[PDB]
Symmetry: C2
C-alpha cells in the first residue's frame, strides 16, 4: 500500500463540541488507517481558546466555525458549509405550520447557542432582517444541552443540522430551515508562517478533497 505507513509523530487538534461529535470521527477513522503510527490528540475548547492554542503552537490544527478566518495570525481553509435547523417536540404547533417563517419561529421561547459560538450570529442576523430579537430562554455551549431542554418542554431549539438535529432521540424532530438562515463554514486553521510535519498537511486534504497540499502550503508561507 502507502508510503505513510511508518510515518510517526503527534498530531494535536483543537476543536469545538460540534465537530468533535458530528464531523471529526469519520475523518479520524480515515487518518488512523492512513497513519497508524501517528499519535492523535484532541483538545476541546471555545473558538477563542482554539485560536490561542494555535498562536502558541500548543495545537497543530484548529477547527471551528468562528474566529479563525479573521485572525491576522492564522490562515484558515474551508472544510464544509452547514445550516441551522429547528428542533421541536414531535407534535409541536410548529410542525403543523407551513411554510416555516422567522415570524413563526420568533413566537416561541428559543433554546440555542451563546454568542460567538456555532453560528449564533447567523441566527441573530436572520431575525435582525425582520426587526426582531429572538426570545432566548437558554444559552448553551453545546447541542446536547439544547436537546435536553427541548425534550423537557422548555422551548424549541435552533441547532446545527449535523448535530443530527436529533433523529435518534425520539419524540424530537428536526425541521429544515435552510431558506431562513445564511450558511456557515467550518474552518481548518493553521498558524501563519509555520512549517508543519507531513501528516498535518495530509490531514486537511482528508477533510476537503478540494484542497491541494501545494496551495495550502504556498499560502501559509505567503508571509
Amino acid at each position: 500500500s502507502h508510503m505513510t505507513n511508518d510515518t510517526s509523530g503527534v498530531l494535536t487538534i483543537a476543536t469545538t463540541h460540534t465537530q468533535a461529535r458530528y464531523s471529526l470521527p469519520e475523518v479520524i477513522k480515515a487518518f488512523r488507517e492512513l497513519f497508524p503510527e501517528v499519535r492523535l490528540e484532541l483538545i476541546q475548547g471555545t473558538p477563542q481558546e482554539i485560536a490561542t492554542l494555535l498562536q502558541n503552537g500548543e495545537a497543530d490544527i484548529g477547527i471551528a466555525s468562528e474566529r479563525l478566518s479573521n485572525d491576522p495570525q492564522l490562515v484558515a481553509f474551508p472544510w464544509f458549509r452547514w445550516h441551522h435547523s429547528l428542533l421541536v417536540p414531535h407534535d409541536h404547533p410548529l410542525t403543523q405550520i407551513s411554510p416555516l417563517t422567522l415570524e413563526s419561529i420568533a413566537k416561541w421561547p428559543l433554546i440555542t447557542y451563546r454568542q460567538g459560538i456555532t453560528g449564533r450570529s447567523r441566527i441573530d442576523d436572520a431575525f435582525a432582517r425582520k426587526g426582531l430579537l429572538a426570545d432566548i430562554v437558554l444559552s448553551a455551549q453545546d447541542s446536547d444541552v439544547i436537546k435536553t431542554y427541548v425534550a423537557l418542554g422548555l422551548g424549541i431549539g435552533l441547532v446545527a443540522e449535523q448535530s443530527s438535529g436529533e433523529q435518534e432521540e425520539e419524540n424530537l424532530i428536526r425541521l429544515d430551515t435552510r431558506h431562513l438562515f445564511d450558511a456557515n463554514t467550518v474552518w481548518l486553521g493553521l498558524k501563519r508562517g509555520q512549517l508543519q510535519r507531513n501528516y498535518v498537511w495530509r490531514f486537511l486534504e482528508l477533510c476537503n478533497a478540494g484542497l491541494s497540499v501545494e496551495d495550502i502550503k504556498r499560502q501559509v508561507m505567503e508571509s
Copy 2:
C-alpha cells in the same frame, strides 16, 4: 403551592454541562409546577464564568462543582456528592482486569475533563499519589464528547457517574472506581449579602431537603 400560583419574574440559573444534563432537569420540572408563572432562564458556562455572572448579578443562582465554595464574594451550599467512574468498550481488557487499580488504569490513553472542570483534580491527585501522570489523549469540556471518543476507539474515559443516566451507552460499560478517586461536591452559590425574590430562596430548598429557607437567608446575609 396555590400560595405561589401567580408568583412571577425571571429566574436566571448559570450552570455547567454536567448539571444541565444530568441533575437539573428533574428539579426544573418540579420548579415549573410549583411556580408556573415564573420564567426560568439558563446560561451554560465554565465554573469561572459562573462565578463572574454571580458577582455581576447577571445570574441569580450558580451551580458547579468547582470554584464556588472558595470565592470570598459568594456563598455556596452543598447539593450532593458524586464520583467519577470508568467508561470502556464492551470487550476491553479492563473489563477483564480485576481489582482495578490506579496503576492499571494509568497504562491506557485517557479521555477525560480538562483541568479545572468536573473534578479533574481528583483524578490528577489520585494519580500523583502513585507518582504518576495520566496520559490525556483527549481533554474534554463535557461528558458527551468523552462518550463519542471512547466509542470510537481513541481510549478509555473517566466520567462523572451521573452521566450514565439516559439512553445509556450501547456497547460501552461503566466500571466502578469509587475506591480509587475521592468524591466531588456540587455547589449551589448565591452572591453574598444579596437580597432575592421569593422563588430563588425556594429553588435552593427544593434542591436540598437538608437546608431550610431561613438558614439559607441567614447565612447569605450574616456578613
